[PDB]
Design an enzyme around this catalytic site. Structure first.
Site, mmCIF file in Angstrom:
data_model
loop_
_atom_site.group_PDB
_atom_site.id
_atom_site.type_symbol
_atom_site.label_atom_id
_atom_site.label_comp_id
_atom_site.label_asym_id
_atom_site.label_seq_id
_atom_site.Cartn_x
_atom_site.Cartn_y
_atom_site.Cartn_z
ATOM 1 N N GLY A 13 20.897 54.579 -2.677
ATOM 2 C CA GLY A 13 20.121 55.074 -3.796
ATOM 3 C C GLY A 13 18.651 54.723 -3.694
ATOM 4 N N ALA A 14 18.067 54.928 -2.517
ATOM 5 C CA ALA A 14 16.670 54.573 -2.267
ATOM 6 C C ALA A 14 15.728 55.748 -2.510
ATOM 7 C CB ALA A 14 16.520 54.039 -0.848
ATOM 8 N N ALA A 15 15.814 56.347 -3.698
ATOM 9 C CA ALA A 15 14.884 57.402 -4.080
ATOM 10 C C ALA A 15 14.341 57.261 -5.492
ATOM 11 C CB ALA A 15 15.540 58.782 -3.937
ATOM 12 N N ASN B 213 26.943 54.366 -16.091
ATOM 13 C CA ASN B 213 26.638 53.657 -14.852
ATOM 14 C C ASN B 213 27.900 53.209 -14.126
ATOM 15 O OD1 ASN B 213 23.838 53.639 -14.283
ATOM 16 N ND2 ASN B 213 23.472 52.187 -15.953
ATOM 17 N N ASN C 235 21.565 47.195 -13.536
ATOM 18 C CA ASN C 235 21.119 46.390 -14.673
ATOM 19 C C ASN C 235 22.253 45.693 -15.417
ATOM 20 O OD1 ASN C 235 18.944 45.339 -16.107
ATOM 21 N ND2 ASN C 235 18.008 47.354 -16.436
ATOM 22 N N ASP D 217 15.940 36.252 -13.721
ATOM 23 C CA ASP D 217 15.752 35.425 -14.908
ATOM 24 C C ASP D 217 15.308 34.015 -14.573
ATOM 25 O OD1 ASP D 217 17.549 37.623 -16.280
ATOM 26 O OD2 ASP D 217 18.767 36.655 -14.739
ATOM 27 N N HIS E 145 23.337 37.363 -17.392
ATOM 28 C CA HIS E 145 22.108 38.138 -17.319
ATOM 29 C C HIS E 145 21.814 38.930 -18.587
ATOM 30 C CE1 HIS E 145 18.733 40.220 -15.646
ATOM 31 N NE2 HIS E 145 18.999 39.861 -14.402
#
Lengths: 275, 323, 323, 323, 323
Positions: E8-10, E103, E128, E159, E185
């Protein structure tokens, strides 16, 4: 043989010095006389075989041990020595010849070490600093002494002092110009010091005392190989190999690991000749 | 991975090079030390450093030297790189005829002992007569029957370091990393190549002075130290850098270009010259040509070729009179 | 722009320190050298390494050492950091009294001569008897009349190096960059702090063994080297890093926190002790409290306080004898 | 201390350029982001990074981009380096030379607003075309009465990076640091100098193909992006590297040699060219000559000057219409 | 040699992560890129920086997302590290409950096709909702049959970057490299251990305010961005750094201590928690105890573990539901 059987590992259990096969000399009647006579009128290869044959009978023959080591030094064989001379020294520690002849054998292998101790034992009969100190001793006393005066060169050679070693040989050479040994030393220092051409003539003359001193002609080969004429070295090492051993049905070769040394030179020669 | 063994790490070109290698060696690689005297005193000194992942091994030897020391036969197991740095210093003593013989009597043993247990290992010569002592190492390797021309190098980077220091002072609006150097390692043999660098050059009246000062360099250091030593601090730096280059090339994290002093392999005659090569996973990979040469450097190159031919002949036949 | 000058860069310690310094200093820096013997030879040898911006300057003293040597006052103009390395080896014993006396005299002379020229500099004493030489330097500075308690840093880092190395060796594979160490620098006067590091500390008896080893590791090195010499390579690493910390703190590129032998003003009862500090643009900027500890460490701290009191009491006891 | 500011740090170039620049700025530096929209978001993204010694300051400046934005006048009170990045997307449904007319006014007013209060600050131009906007910036600077040919650089490092990578793929495993490229920064105005680097070059046909491939470089990415955007992950890298070089030269820690589209100042027939220069504490210091040129490369650096003359004339006749 | 693949490098975060990654990978790498839309454009934009020794591979997208994409399998060949960064913007549009369903279903498809071709590879999850996506990945891996517990990590460094930045901004001259943060997180599942750092910690009220700030700072970026996007740059460096550690722990040149959302085999009753670990060649080697905790932080730890219990329960409830 009936009872002549083994005796080889029997004498080998303590003396690791190999005796090798093909030594018929050992049983003719008594090989000592022919062994001792062969030095003057013949070569010095089968003489070592006769000395071994007379020595294997019993380990108490001090003469056999003190002569076998000296004989196994001419015919380039300075690996079968050392141990035999040490065993001879064990029999008698006051003997003069075994100590003197044991230093020429520990300097070819570059052992240093026990060579200084042997020189000190010969004379009495930092390690280097102590040895050189006691050595001085008769700095003048017994000047006409051949052995003491010549020992200075051997002391210098183990410290890379080829400058004064030849100088003291020059006086030692003319004192007793009969034995080839003192003359060979005279050559070595020169060769081992950017001075080849000044010694080869001696190498020739030395041969008139006893044509067979493999060491002199081996040094001839080395010097001429270092002095241009890269061939010739081959046409001397080939005869060196032949005269070295093998004239009595390869002498019962056995191991002959030490002989490698010689064979090695042939290669370094051929190669530099692109062959 | 990667084991480096410095042979003779108890002098001035010893402990200092070892200290330099300690703080730059990659994580997870050991380091070995050997010397006839003082080795335990260096091992007990380099083991109190907070660097993590580095382990130190050491061996000693009898003060009277003995051929084929048993300690080396055991310590030289598993070693990947050997740095032959031992030997007598560059003390003036007497003329060069005796120092070469003394060092030939040492390299012959310290190569024979090491190459018997670990054949596949890179060798770095950082001794004296490096024009005369490299052929001795080659001959010693050829005897035992194992010899790889791709894994025998002569560390001649000190001349390059000196050369790329005087052109950066007179011509100091600019900075350049390196300059080509050819020839060998001697007085009249080193030939700097200043015609292959970016930027304009000064007049020829100064370039010849720079080239002469590059050739005659160590004599001024010797004079500055009277007679109580020579230059060792600036020579351990070049050796450490070359060793790091070799280690990185062996690991696979770099393929650098180095000059060194390596076999020509039938490319320029005089089969031991200092020409640029590229390292790799398996030692030397490609031997590059010298390149364009100014017409004023051809004379220097031919004189250097003749001198190196004579030196190669003299060194490839160091034998002994036995006696 | 910095002008780090090293004094006594010719002995066993200092030759490596100069080499390590002249490979990491920032561009445009300037090094200096000075010793009675060998300084020209070190300078002429270190000037052959390619490092743009770094300039090397040197001077040599007279063989009959005259107090306040003119050759040193010429090198004391426009200097930022002064590091003292000069000393008289170790000798094979010969009692500590004479060695300590000669070291104290040398330190007094050098500090007076250097501080008589450039007052607002930094002093980074390295001489082995730190616990008593540092108050000597402080007293001499007060006698001159330009004493500042924020610029005097006796180097105490080899203890941290040893403690970190031991912890990393005995708690594999856990790595901790640094370990706090308090007290002085001698025998029992050291007290490492092992309760202020993140991790499951191994045990109690083993921890006490580690404390004993880090206390008595000094004698181990001198025992390994037969009976001659001292720790040289290891001690040269703890000086270069501290000098780099001071230089990068002065230059404004970092504000690090370290442990050093300082001139504590208040807080702890001891007039001099090694406690954590932070180095700003004007030397020490804030003195941190020691922090919570354990009772077993509290007893060692009390004993160390007693020994420190005795050492500095004697230090100004014999220093007044000059007047 | 520096106060490098990015003008237009909210597009496809500023966002990555700021992130790359923040991670490598020295201790005690400062950033300054500015844009018409989106500045607070970028300021919030970069304010949550653990780097110590970096201060982030921002300002946004009204919609309907007003002439002379009062907000930008405030964020110009000590900035030492200005990085002009604010441009406009090409609207990939549009083509032709309808890009020069719109970006020229933005460059003019941004440069005027920035330079009206901080004359002593280097200006780096990243927006395209660079060879048509650099004369515009020069005219704008000359209009207000303050100008300095040394502190006016046009970024052109992208072509050098592209050429360096293209030759390393055809000479593996031999690598070179950089490749000289001169001329301009547009289509046929660039010429690579492949005959000035060490190593045996390949044949002529491959060299010509590689030379042509470098020229047609800004259109292959657009074709690979299917008409949605231009390359922005390499322009940010080039800008960050050039800004780092300029900052390091300004602070005094380096004197690099670069290739920047600058004024020749009577050293060439063209009024602006990409000559090789060396930086320093006051910007450009020396203008090195191009040097030897291959015969085949002469025609290229005779068409390049011809086209760049027309480009400069077109870009400079625009200033008289405005102002 | 390693093979790092980014899935997912776009998007906004994928490009910056890739750019930061292709500047620190060791010499010799096969960095790969993949996305449904925008893959070739970003692929033929990083293959222009020189960075000699790195090969860039990429795949092509397809029609509107299809499970088990054929192109992904081809690029899913021998690869050591898999980075899962693809997803959907979190805060824009709010809908916390709905967005999870958006997601999770992506991850449930990404892990299945990415695995089964490279079973022995790491998984650095970057999406996330870290608290409730690592259990989903674990459940998916259990179904296939390979669930190496030491090769599944959830990035969390972010964090701490925030806590370290906040603390160092108060205590000013003092700087601490890292600060321990445990829990999870989410908003209330994060508790920082400020009692395990060396120094004079501030008052309790300021400590409480700082603790609250790190639990809410993820909304400040959204409020400053007017809800258009979220934090992209700051999260782009937390991952690209952490992944580097894995490489430096997998290639065999380091052994660092990191904090990650790992599987608690024993220790606490909670199946998953953010506790310190020690990476290694095979993955996770040692899992240190949390350590001393003051009285105040115990209640926060209890509340955090209570909340993450329900979070993990929900995580292993969508995986059971599947369709």
């Amino acid at each position: 043989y009936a009872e002549a059987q083994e005796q080889l590992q029997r004498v080998q259990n303590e003396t690791n010095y190999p005796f090798e096969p093909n030594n018929p000399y050992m049983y003719h009647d008594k090989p000592m006389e022919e062994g001792i006579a062969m030095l003057q009128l013949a070569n010095m290869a089968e003489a070592a075989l006769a000395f071994e044959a007379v020595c294997q009978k019993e380990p108490e023959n001090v003469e056999a041990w003190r002569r076998l080591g000296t004989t196994q030094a001419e015919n380039e064989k300075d690996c079968l020595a050392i141990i035999a001379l040490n065993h001879a020294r064990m029999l008698d520690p006051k003997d003069i010849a075994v100590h003197a002849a044991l230093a020429v054998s520990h300097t070819n292998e570059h052992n240093v070490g026990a060579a200084l101790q042997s020189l000190r034992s010969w004379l009495l009969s930092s390690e280097y600093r102590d040895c050189c100190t006691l050595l001085y001793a008769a700095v003048e006393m017994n000047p006409n002494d051949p052995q003491l005066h010549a020992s200075l060169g051997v002391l210098h050679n183990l410290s890379h002092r080829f400058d004064e070693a030849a100088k003291n040989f020059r006086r030692a050479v003319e004192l007793r110009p009969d034995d080839a040994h003192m003359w060979n030393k005279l050559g070595a220092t020169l060769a081992n010091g950017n001075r080849p051409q000044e010694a080869l003539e001696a190498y020739n003359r030395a041969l008139d005392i006893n044509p067979g001193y493999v060491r002199v002609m081996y040094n001839m080969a080395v010097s001429y190989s270092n002095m241009a004429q890269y061939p010739l070295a081959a046409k001397h090492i080939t005869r060196a190999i032949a005269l070295q051993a093998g004239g009595t049905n390869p002498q019962g070769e056995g191991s002959r690991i030490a002989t490698r040394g010689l064979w090695d030179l042939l290669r370094m020669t051929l190669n530099l000749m692109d062959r | 991975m990667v084991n480096v063994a410095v042979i003779g790490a108890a002098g001035g070109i010893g402990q200092s090079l070892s200290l330099l290698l300690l703080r730059e060696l990659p994580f997870g690689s050991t380091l070995s030390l050997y010397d006839v005297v003082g080795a335990p005193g260096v091992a007990a000194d380099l083991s109190h450093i907070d660097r993590a992942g580095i382990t130190v091994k050491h061996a000693a030897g009898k003060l009277p030297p003995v051929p084929r020391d048993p300690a080396l036969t055991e310590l030289a197991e598993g070693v990947d790189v050997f740095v032959i740095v031992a030997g007598v210093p560059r003390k003036p003593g007497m003329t060069r005829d005796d120092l070469f013989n003394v060092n030939a009597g040492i390299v012959m043993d310290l190569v024979l002992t090491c190459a018997s247990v670990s054949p596949n290992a890179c060798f770095c010569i950082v001794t004296n007569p490096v024009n005369s002592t490299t052929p001795i190492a080659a001959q010693t390797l050829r005897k035992i029957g194992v010899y790889n021309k791709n894994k025998l190098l002569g560390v001649s980077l000190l001349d390059g370091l000196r050369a790329t220091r005087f052109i950066n002072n007179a011509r100091h609006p600019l900075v350049v990393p390196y300059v080509p150097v050819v020839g060998g390692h001697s007085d009249v043999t080193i030939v700097p190549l200043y015609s292959q660098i970016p930027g304009p050059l000064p007049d020829e009246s100064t370039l010849k002075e720079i080239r002469k000062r590059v050739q005659v360099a160590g004599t001024e250091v010797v004079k500055a130290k009277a007679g109580r030593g020579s230059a060792t601090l600036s020579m351990a730096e070049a050796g450490a850098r070359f060793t790091m280059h070799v280690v990185k090339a062996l690991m696979g994290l770099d393929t650098p270009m180095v000059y060194a002093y390596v076999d020509t392999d039938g490319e320029h005659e005089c089969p031991f010259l200092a020409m640029p090569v590229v390292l790799g996973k398996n030692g030397i990979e490609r031997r590059l040509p010298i390149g364009p040469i100014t017409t004023v450097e051809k004379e220097m190159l031919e004189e250097a070729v003749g001198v190196v031919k004579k030196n190669i002949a003299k060194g490839e036949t160091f034998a002994r009179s036995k006696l």
